[PDB]
Amino acid sequence: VLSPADKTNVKAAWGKVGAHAGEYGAEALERMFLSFPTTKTYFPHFDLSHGSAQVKGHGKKVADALTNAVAHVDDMPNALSALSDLHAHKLRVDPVNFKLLSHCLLVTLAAHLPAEFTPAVHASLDKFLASVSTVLTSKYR
Amino acid sequence: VLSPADKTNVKAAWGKVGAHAGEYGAEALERMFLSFPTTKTYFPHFDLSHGSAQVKGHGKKVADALTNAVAHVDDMPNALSALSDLHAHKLRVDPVNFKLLSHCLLVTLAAHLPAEFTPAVHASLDKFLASVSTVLTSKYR
Amino acid sequence: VHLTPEEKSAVTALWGKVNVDEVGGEALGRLLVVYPWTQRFFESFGDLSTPDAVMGNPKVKAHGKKVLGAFSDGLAHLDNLKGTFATLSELHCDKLHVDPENFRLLGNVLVCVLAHHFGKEFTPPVQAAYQKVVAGVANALAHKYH
Amino acid sequence: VHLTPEEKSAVTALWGKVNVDEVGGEALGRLLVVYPWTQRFFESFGDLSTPDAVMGNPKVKAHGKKVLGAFSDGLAHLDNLKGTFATLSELHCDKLHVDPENFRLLGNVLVCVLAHHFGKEFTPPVQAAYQKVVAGVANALAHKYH
Ligand code: HEM
Ligand code: HEM
Numbered sequence: 001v002l003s004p005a006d007k008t009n010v011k012a013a014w015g016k017v018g019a020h021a022g023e024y025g026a027e028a029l030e031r032m033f034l035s036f037p038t039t040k041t042y043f044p045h046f047d048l049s050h051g052s053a054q055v056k057g058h059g060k061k062v063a064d065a066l067t068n069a070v071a072h073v074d075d076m077p078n079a080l081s082a083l084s085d086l087h088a089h090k091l092r093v094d095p096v097n098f099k100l101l102s103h104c105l106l107v108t109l110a111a112h113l114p115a116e117f118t119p120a121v122h123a124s125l126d127k128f129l130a131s132v133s134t135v136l137t138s139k140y141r
Numbered sequence: 142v143l144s145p146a147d148k149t150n151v152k153a154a155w156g157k158v159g160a161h162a163g164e165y166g167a168e169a170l171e172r173m174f175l176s177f178p179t180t181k182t183y184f185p186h187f188d189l190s191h192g193s194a195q196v197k198g199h200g201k202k203v204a205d206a207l208t209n210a211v212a213h214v215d216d217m218p219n220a221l222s223a224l225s226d227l228h229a230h231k232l233r234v235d236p237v238n239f240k241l242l243s244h245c246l247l248v249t250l251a252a253h254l255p256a257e258f259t260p261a262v263h264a265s266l267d268k269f270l271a272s273v274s275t276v277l278t279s280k281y282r
Numbered sequence: 283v284h285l286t287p288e289e290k291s292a293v294t295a296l297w298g299k300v301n302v303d304e305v306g307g308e309a310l311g312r313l314l315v316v317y318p319w320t321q322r323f324f325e326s327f328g329d330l331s332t333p334d335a336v337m338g339n340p341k342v343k344a345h346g347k348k349v350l351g352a353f354s355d356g357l358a359h360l361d362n363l364k365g366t367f368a369t370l371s372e373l374h375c376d377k378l379h380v381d382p383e384n385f386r387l388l389g390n391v392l393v394c395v396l397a398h399h400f401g402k403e404f405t406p407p408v409q410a411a412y413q414k415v416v417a418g419v420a421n422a423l424a425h426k427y428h
Numbered sequence: 429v430h431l432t433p434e435e436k437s438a439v440t441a442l443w444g445k446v447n448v449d450e451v452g453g454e455a456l457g458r459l460l461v462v463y464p465w466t467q468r469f470f471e472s473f474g475d476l477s478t479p480d481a482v483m484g485n486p487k488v489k490a491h492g493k494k495v496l497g498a499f500s501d502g503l504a505h506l507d508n509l510k511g512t513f514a515t516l517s518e519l520h521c522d523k524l525h526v527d528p529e530n531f532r533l534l535g536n537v538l539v540c541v542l543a544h545h546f547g548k549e550f551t552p553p554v555q556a557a558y559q560k561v562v563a564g565v566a567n568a569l570a571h572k573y574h
């Protein structure tokens with residue numbers, strides 16, 4: 001769903017992340033690789049080590065796709081159109097992997113924005129990340 | 142998603158279930174109560190025993206909501222509108238419960254329609270049941 | 283496991299009937315078709331781009347009997363589901379990195395396959411018995427993720 | 429658990445810092461807010477109809493310390509996560525019938541709460557250590573569902 005207020009909170013915690021969005025995105029990715037080592041399977045052409053440029057630059061990409069989702073939130077399906085294809089067709093990502101990343105994303109927002117990371121924004125963000133994930137696994141559906 | 146062919150297979154395995162849809166629906170429910178005993182919690186005003194009329198009559202209701210989903214498949218959201226409210230607002234059903242039922246539903250189609258229950262229809266049906274479930278848990282989303 | 287005598291009676295008595303050359307493969311196949319991501323794991327196996335091509339693929343039926351194998355092993359070794367499966371857990375866990383939820387999925391597709399094969403003889407109580415077992419099995423394999 | 433020395437070093441050293449009167453409740457609360465179905469289980473607890481009402485509810489903070497309690501018990505009893513939690517598993521399993529996935533959810537919200545509380549001090553390796561632990565704990569409680 002995402003309500004007028006989810007969309008407001010998500011409009012806003014993102015507001016507040018600004019320019020670091022890619023730095024966070026690179027951190028969320030590191031966390032996941034670290035916490036859920038099974039995810040590492042998708043990335044065998046990456047150096048998955050701390051200061052890795054490839055993950056750095058990947059963070060940037062995830063982060064950008066997330067921002068394209070915030071801005072077009074009321075139309076993520078057409079907007080994440082091609083990442084849906086890429087992740088579910090071409091990469092065959094296990095949908096459980098969307099839950100682990102999404103979680104490292106919230107742990108990374110939280111770890112960064114504690115003023116902003118209210119129980120209710122935590123909720124809006126979760127729900128949002130769920131919608132993004134549902135979209136990028138919807139050609140399995 | 143649900144493709145022109147999912148929608149064709151689902152149009153059709155249902156075709157083929159006809160009049161027994163409520164009898165099956167009552168069976169799927171029994172299976173679940175039996176296989177996943179945690180689900181029993183929602184139904185403390187039911188006799189959950191084999192020949193129980195309340196489950197019989199419940200089957201009828203689940204089955205009917207499923208048929209209203211097949212017929213309006215390209216608009217389940219507005220159609221399952223009020224069951225969404227009832228299950229997620231008012232009943233607070235654990236979304237994991239939608240996965241266990243959906244599964245007993247396929248085991249019950251399968252156990253009944255082995256000509257029809259092709260690998261591909263199994264797939265269409267799964268996907269369909271997933272969409273219904275996503276709809277009835279979408280005011281958590 | 284527990285498996286009460288009557289549940290025991292019911293699991294054992296169906297399994298005897300089961301075509302082990304052809305049931306394992308109907309369930310691996312159904313998995314790849316129903317849950318496409320899982321075909322990530324069998325790119326080595328040939329054309330799976332259409333489910334017809336999945337269900338008459340010989341590597342697919344070749345492999346699926348291996349998989350019922352291990353079930354026959356567990357189904358009547360329920361006392362240490364965990365012992366029996368360690369090597370296999372190791373293979374799928376820290377060797378193919380298969381997330382444990384596909385272990386429930388196979389489990390459940392297996393329950394689907396048996397229901398399709400036995401029809402009415404697959405009553406809700408027998409299904410209930412089998413669920414526990416498929417559970418035990420998914421839990422045994424996923425134990426080296428810890 | 430395993431917990432390597434360094435992971436051990438990292439779990440233990442954060443937990444010392446943790447405000448146990450107020451962290452347990454920020455995580456039970458976050459659960460009820462983030463995952464509303466779970467408030468099924470605390471109808472006995474008062475107004476939860478708004479998250480503000482959840483986060484200054486005294487029964488909610490009352491209960492959440494009980495819950496960090498058990499974690500403190502497990503976190504430094506990792507050798508039999510299973511022994512420690514049996515009674516609790518029994519209570520939630522065949523007594524409140526809480527599906528084990530909410531055990532992962534709490535686990536993860538707990539990881540969120542710690543990250544919010546420690547910020548940068550909650551590095552990815554420490555998070556990685558904690559994930560295993562929250563896992564072990566979700567798996568220990570859900571063990572009487574078998
Ligand atoms: C909200 C969730 C995520 C977002 C928004 C996202 C977005 C993206 C984007 C923007 C790219 C590249 C698009 C381009 O090619 O320009 C990408 C690549 C990729 N993603 Fe995701 N992704 C997400 C989750 C995941 C998860 C869960 C996995 C699996 C662990 C995954 C695996 C991959 C793989 C491996 C690639 C290709 C990397 C490469 O080969 O260069 N992604 N993702
Ligand atoms: C595809 C999934 C399902 C469908 C289509 C469905 C549909 C329905 C329908 C049609 C009714 C009543 C509507 C009316 O009041 O006229 C109902 C009631 C209810 N459902 Fe579901 N349902 C589904 C899954 C579930 C699951 C997963 C649970 C939890 C185990 C659940 C728990 C309930 C409860 C307890 C009621 C109220 C029974 C009563 O108090 O009389 N349902 N459902």
Ligand code: HEM
Nearest residue numbers: 320323324348349352353374378380384385388389419420
């Ligand atoms: C109850 C669950 C399962 C059982 C009983 C099972 C059993 C087995 C056995 C018997 C083998 C190989 C034995 C050997 O090589 O000597 C195997 C291999 C493998 N399994 Fe499974 N498995 C299960 C679940 C899964 C699932 C869910 C997938 C993930 C999609 C999976 C993917 C694989 C792959 C691709 C191999 C090939 C191993 C190789 O040759 O490298 N398995 N499994």
Ligand code: HEM
Nearest residue numbers: 466469470494495498499520524526530531534535565566
């Ligand atoms: C790691 C997971 C959890 C731990 C450590 C935990 C720990 C506890 C403890 C300490 C108590 C009561 C101790 C006592 O009564 O003496 C309890 C009770 C209870 N738990 Fe949890 N719990 C966990 C997960 C859950 C989850 C996910 C829910 C489901 C939404 C849940 C629902 C309840 C309920 C409502 C009670 C109240 C018991 C009663 O007074 O009847 N718990 N839990």
